[PDB]
Amino acid sequence: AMDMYVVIVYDVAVERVNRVKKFLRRHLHWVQNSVFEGEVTLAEFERIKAGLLDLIDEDEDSVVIYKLRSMPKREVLGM
Amino acid sequence: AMDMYVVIVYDVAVERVNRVKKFLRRHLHWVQNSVFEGEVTLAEFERIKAGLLDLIDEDEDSVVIYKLRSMPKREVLGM
Questions:
Q1: Residue A48 to residue A55: CA distance in whole angstroms
Q2: What is the CATH number of domain B1-69?
Q3: How many Cβ contacts (< 8 angstroms) between chains A and B?
Q4: Can you spell out the DSSP letters for chain B?
Q5: Substitution target from B4, B9, B54, B69 for chain A, most A beta carbons within 10 A
Q6: Do B54 and B5 contact (CB within 8 A), yes or no?
Q7: Which residue in chain B has the smallest CA separation from A63?
Q8: Pair type for strands A29-32 and A35-40
Q9: With contact defined as beta carbons under 8 Å apart, do A37 and A31 qualify?
Q10: Structural domain boundaries of chain A?
Q11: How many whole angstroms separate alpha carbon A27 and alpha carbon B34?
Q12: Which of A28, B1, B10, B26 sits 20 to 30 Å CA-CA off A72?
């Protein structure tokens, strides 16, 4: 995590969700539907945040960016 | 985080997703569509995992359980 590690989850209306997905695929690892994660610099986090704000309707959509010190441990069920 | 703090994201087929949602609402905080988080004991994590395994089809569905030391910092866009 050069500066930090993020996990991003999003709940975006159907008219906008697939543009958010395509943008985040250019910056982070796709985990499953509407979940991305990866290491970022502080400047890259600012650019991700600014890109998301341009694509979402802030009265309708919700993006949660968890900010972590390094890649978190996880357990996968299924898959 | 009595023992640990979890963030759970899930990608479950339509026939099963709403039973997974209802189960996790009994154990964790609902963040947005298909995302839950909260503090758990080790025994409670085992019971959550066992409950999820009973409700999902492990050939189709995917649940990712991030295991964290405490409640993570996060930034919300929108909402």
A1: 11
A2: 3.30.70.240
A3: 107
A4: --SEEEEEEEE--TTTHHHHHHHHHTTSEEEETTEEEEEE-HHHHHHHHHHHHHHS-TTT-EEEEEEESSPPEEEEEE-
A5: B9
A6: no
A7: B77
A8: antiparallel
A9: yes
A10: 1-69
A11: 22
A12: B26
d(CA B32, CA B34): 6
At B76, list the tokens: 């919300």
Both structure tokens of B33: 């569509």
Residues of A in Cβ contact (< 8 Å) with B3: none
With a CB cutoff of 8 Å and minimum separation 6, the contacts of B75 are A49, A64, A65, A67
Residue with tokens 């909402």: B79
Both tokens of residue B38? Answer: 């909260």
Annotated resolution, angstroms: 1.7
**Exposure of A33 in the CB half-sphere (CA atoms within 13 A):** 15
Method: X-ray
Residues B74 and A62: beta-carbon distance below 8 Å: no
